[PDB]
Amino acid sequence: RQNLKSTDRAVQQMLDKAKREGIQTVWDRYEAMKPQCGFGETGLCCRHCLQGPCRINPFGDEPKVGICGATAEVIVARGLDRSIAAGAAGHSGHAKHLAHTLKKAVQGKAASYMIKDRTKLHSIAKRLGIPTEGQKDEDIALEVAKAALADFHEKDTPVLWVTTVLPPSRVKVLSAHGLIPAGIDHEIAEIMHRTSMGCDADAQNLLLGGLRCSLADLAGCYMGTDLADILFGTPAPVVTESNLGVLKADAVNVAVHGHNPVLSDIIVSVSKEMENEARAAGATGINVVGICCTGNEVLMRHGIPACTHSVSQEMAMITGALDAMILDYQCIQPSVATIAECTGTTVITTMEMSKITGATHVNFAEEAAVENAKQILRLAIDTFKRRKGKPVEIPNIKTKVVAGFSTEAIINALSKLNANDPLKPLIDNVVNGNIRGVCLFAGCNNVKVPQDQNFTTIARKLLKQNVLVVATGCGAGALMRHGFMDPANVDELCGDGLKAVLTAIGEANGLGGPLPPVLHMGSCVDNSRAVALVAALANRLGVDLDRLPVVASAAEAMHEKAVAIGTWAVTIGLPTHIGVLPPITGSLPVTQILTSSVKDITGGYFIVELDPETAADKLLAAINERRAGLGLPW
Amino acid sequence: RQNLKSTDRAVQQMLDKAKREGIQTVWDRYEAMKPQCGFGETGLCCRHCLQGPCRINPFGDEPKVGICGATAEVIVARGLDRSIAAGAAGHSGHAKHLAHTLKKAVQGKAASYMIKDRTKLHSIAKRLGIPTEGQKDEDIALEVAKAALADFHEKDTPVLWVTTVLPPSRVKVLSAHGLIPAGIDHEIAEIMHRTSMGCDADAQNLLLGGLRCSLADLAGCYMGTDLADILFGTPAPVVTESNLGVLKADAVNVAVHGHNPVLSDIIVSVSKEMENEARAAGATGINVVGICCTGNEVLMRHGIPACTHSVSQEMAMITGALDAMILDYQCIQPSVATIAECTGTTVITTMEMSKITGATHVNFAEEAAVENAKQILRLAIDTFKRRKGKPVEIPNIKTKVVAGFSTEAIINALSKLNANDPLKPLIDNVVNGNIRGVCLFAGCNNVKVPQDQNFTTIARKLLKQNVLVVATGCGAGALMRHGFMDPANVDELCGDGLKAVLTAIGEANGLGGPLPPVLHMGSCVDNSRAVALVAALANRLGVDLDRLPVVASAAEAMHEKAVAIGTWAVTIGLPTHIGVLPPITGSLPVTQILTSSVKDITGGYFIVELDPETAADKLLAAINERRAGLGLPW
Numbered sequence A, B: 001r002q003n004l005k006s007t008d009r010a011v012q013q014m015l016d017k018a019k020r021e022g023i024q025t026v027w028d029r030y031e032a033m034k035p036q037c038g039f040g041e042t043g044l045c046c047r048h049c050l051q052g053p054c055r056i057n058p059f060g061d062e063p064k065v066g067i068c069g070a071t072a073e074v075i076v077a078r079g080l081d082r083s084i085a086a087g088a089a090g091h092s093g094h095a096k097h098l099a100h101t102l103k104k105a106v107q108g109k110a111a112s113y114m115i116k117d118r119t120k121l122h123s124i125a126k127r128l129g130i131p132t133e134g135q136k137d138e139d140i141a142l143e144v145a146k147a148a149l150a151d152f153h154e155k156d157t158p159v160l161w162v163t164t165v166l167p168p169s170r171v172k173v174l175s176a177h178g179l180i181p182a183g184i185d186h187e188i189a190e191i192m193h194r195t196s197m198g199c200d201a202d203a204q205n206l207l208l209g210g211l212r213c214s215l216a217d218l219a220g221c222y223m224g225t226d227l228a229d230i231l232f233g234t235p236a237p238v239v240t241e242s243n244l245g246v247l248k249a250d251a252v253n254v255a256v257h258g259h260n261p262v263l264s265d266i267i268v269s270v271s272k273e274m275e276n277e278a279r280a281a282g283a284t285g286i287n288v289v290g291i292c293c294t295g296n297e298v299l300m301r302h303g304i305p306a307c308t309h310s311v312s313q314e315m316a317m318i319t320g321a322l323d324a325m326i327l328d329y330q331c332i333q334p335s336v337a338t339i340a341e342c343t344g345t346t347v348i349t350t351m352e353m354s355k356i357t358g359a360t361h362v363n364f365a366e367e368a369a370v371e372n373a374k375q376i377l378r379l380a381i382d383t384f385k386r387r388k389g390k391p392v393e394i395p396n397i398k399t400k401v402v403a404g405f406s407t408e409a410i411i412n413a414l415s416k417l418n419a420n421d422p423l424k425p426l427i428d429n430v431v432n433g434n435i436r437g438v439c440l441f442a443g444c445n446n447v448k449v450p451q452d453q454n455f456t457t458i459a460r461k462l463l464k465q466n467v468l469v470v471a472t473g474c475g476a477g478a479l480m481r482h483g484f485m486d487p488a489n490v491d492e493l494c495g496d497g498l499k500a501v502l503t504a505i506g507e508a509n510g511l512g513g514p515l516p517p518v519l520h521m522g523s524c525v526d527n528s529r530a531v532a533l534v535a536a537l538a539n540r541l542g543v544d545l546d547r548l549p550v551v552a553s554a555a556e557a558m559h560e561k562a563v564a565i566g567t568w569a570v571t572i573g574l575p576t577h578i579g580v581l582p583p584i585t586g587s588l589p590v591t592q593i594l595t596s597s598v599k600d601i602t603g604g605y606f607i608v609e610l611d612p613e614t615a616a617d618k619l620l621a622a623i624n625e626r627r628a629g630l631g632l633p634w
């Protein structure tokens, strides 16, 4: 019963093929892991020193406390903090790499890169306080890249990619609680110090540190989006397709997979130059397709079709038609390197700090980006040739996807209804009930949850209740692969009020039809775009974020990055659902802080709920409580 | 049988008292934890994402691989890397705090702090390339503090507290392998990124990253020593005492405990100002005593007696005479906060990122250091008053300790035998066999090992074989508490050749007697002093460190900091014993890299050996192999 594993029919088809071919998948490796350790599941395990491992029984008799005296409270809080720091390290490492890419570009060191979005560059410079009048664009961009790098360490200002992106009233609440990061890598290191043995051992103190480090993660996300938009262009609405049926047996199929699109944006453009070289090898052309967030990035900017997402990533290879899988970093199952030998896929790593035994490595360098891309595409072409005459099994399953809803694009779309107060039509429709509130779906799939089931179950209920739904990362992937980004499905999925608004906006944008049921706001760092939108609404209304009818749902969360995002969503003031258990239930006091008393600090709070129908009800109640707090009917 | 728990008779006496009083200790919490998890012991557990916890059976059947595909190799290497990063975060967080203290001092912002060692300041400035001629000391010190802070992030130079402290030939070997850190907090964050799910998945690549992050840890250690010496003075030989008998029933007993002595150095001086206030409360005075490395710091600089060390720290409180325990951060068992209620000790935290539930917090600030110290000592005095009339049980057990052997002091002592080539007498005696080689004992005690048993067993065998033994941290604590820093024990402990050299040096220093059997080089960051000595010998000889007959032994290792130190000892070229199992044995390939093939990268290697007699033999063989490589008899 492949339906217990994934709700995606293309994935189910490939699961049957993998089974008959004897290829182990993530779902088989999960089954082999059961029953999983209950100490780890509940957070009641510590390996922070060589006196361990230590554990605490959730209930019963000894052990009741760690060897050094660490309580369940401390152990749970320390483990959570390290997960936040690791997520911050990934989003901010991505951003740091792009800051170096921009600096190289404008110093003349890598002419394949350039300022593509001059408007974004100037706006970011203005937001940071960097002078633009009289200045060359290359100098403004050097100052922006220098400011980005400076936010990684202590200096005479706090992290500007926090303080300049949230409203002053929110910054004031956070500063009063000591939560504004001093430097991104500074906070990561401070977490690792304070959570090491014999240091911080007070749950409230530890968790305040975690909230602060989650804002370091937010800064990394926002910095990453900003810099990628400068370098590669700010997304605007685009139409494409998703799911495995976007692979083409007669083409060279090249997946771009990971998070940082610094090379894969170049691969997109070079692949078109090599169409005749591909034709000489017997292919129709080079068919670049996306996996995970590198896929989101090229989908949002170029309409490159999305093949698949996190938990089901191996299934692209099982088709037999995936000639190359070009990897950067984050969320890549290392199984891909062994599956590649079974499927004939060439798996290629490109980042120095993310290699996989058995995968060919290309030493990507911005200065050589075009030549690296051609070397990689030539390996893919050679791989296509080797599968001449071999049948493939591409499920003939795909959806239509309208995407590219950056915050700038959303504002522009709304401006067609109110040119000089673009947010007002959205607010008007929240007030009159046509839009009940806003829900951001974010984060990953998780093998513990039948793939996409929580995202689609929750989304369906919210849409019928007139919630405006936006999505990023694998949440966007889940929704796109089930038709939620096809405007043809508005009548079926949306309540009458939401349908009326999506139709009014779409008709004013010349579409003869509505916006899609769900707005794709991009990759995981692009959760920062949702922050920009919500902060803009807060500023337009003169209220803080914790008064707005806006929630988030990491409905199938997996990565440390998703824990970090959920933690800053709480910290900026949002009710934040998580649909998998984080390792917290072994401490009632920590659980109570994260789900209840943090409301008194930041206004936000976690909603931990594994049943998706129940989670939908709790998210609706959170939205409605915010409506009532504003004096609105609900 | 308290002898199974600690070889320290004072500790055994307090273990009997704790047992009859019903006070749980670290040894009782260890017993309650048995049997410990074998997945964690071997390294074959991963909790890096919410699909976990994952584990791998060391032997047998499934599970054989993590859910995402991570092999045993990857899981073990990732866990080790995070431990190195956490150790780097602690030593370097200490150093960063002292850099801010120095900056405050010379900016006029905290007049309790000052440049005490102007010679050290000028030498550090010269080593870094900072101009001194014509410059005010306060300006030279601002530039030194700015350079210290700059080494935490990327810039146009690598980490100077690596590249300027090792010989050029060693820097060249490390650079050729990509091992020179770009920035301290940069590397910490990169480790956390690369070890997060779906990133680096090649054991060799992961472990190269770990070696590089271990050099970030070395930079933090060296920076910490440098800055503490500027601010507080470079140690010189001093005579004091150790063990619980240094507590005095008729005095206010105040322990300073942690690692960063920024406040506790001030407490030492203020305590003497308050002698009449203590007398008015019925005490003879204020008796400051050391625990762990804050204790090492004040012992090395001021001869403050050391009460106890890591694993036995609770036993100071069990005496009933410990009126206050003043905490900074690292290596503090959080049990102290609950034991304090049973024993009448006031436990006081002082650092913002290291609090303990149930302990009073004082918001220490450099600008208020004297007033904070008086507030703290007044709480201690009030606590002493509350124990008027209550019997105490201080074991009447102490040793004589000669300490204060900074590298500068060792060079000065040797200079009495050769004024203008001070290292030559040491080298001469290595060549003629009076000194077989050098062994650094470093790192902690660990509840799994009867306290001090490995340190003293190994040291005894090495000393009889004419090894010059130096020690830091809890290694120094172990050795001092068993008489190894009392020159009266040279005849008993030392081989004839070593005795002859220790006597010759001592007699030339006017002592009428030898140097002590073991030279105390200070706190854990002061392992950097041993690097300075070994690098100076390498430079004098014109060879790299991996040719020298010098080894290290973390004989009872515990903290992530000790894993980091052991890892940079290997990276700089030393055979490095560890006497507890780190979580590596679940991967033979990783074990083989760390104990064998790393020799081909850096020249150093781990020696994992839990039996101390066997470890002594293996350390001797390592020393002797180095002698033979130099053409020397052995």
Ligand code: SF4
Pocket (backbone or CB within 6 Å): A046, A047, A048, A049, A050, A051, A052, A053, A054, A066, A067, A068, A069, A070, A196, A197, A198
């Ligand atoms: S830090 Fe404490 S709880 Fe954690 S492993 Fe070490 S002794 Fe156990």
Ligand code: SF4
Pocket (backbone or CB within 6 Å): B046, B047, B048, B049, B050, B051, B052, B053, B054, B066, B067, B068, B069, B070, B196, B197, B198
């Ligand atoms: S990172 Fe891989 S091995 Fe680790 S918990 Fe997640 S699925 Fe398991």
Ligand code: FES
Pocket (backbone or CB within 6 Å): A037, A038, A039, A040, A041, A045, A046, A053, A055, B037, B040, B045, B047, B053
């Ligand atoms: S005891 Fe299983 S996660 Fe540690």
Ligand code: FES
Pocket (backbone or CB within 6 Å): A037, A040, A045, A047, A053, B037, B038, B039, B040, B041, B045, B046, B053, B055
């Ligand atoms: S299974 Fe015990 S340490 Fe994770």
Ligand SMILES: [Fe+3]
Pocket (backbone or CB within 6 Å): A259, A292, A293, A331, A473, A474, A523, A524
């Ligand atoms: Fe993503």
Ligand SMILES: [Fe+3]
Pocket (backbone or CB within 6 Å): B259, B292, B293, B331, B473, B474, B523, B524
């Ligand atoms: Fe120490």
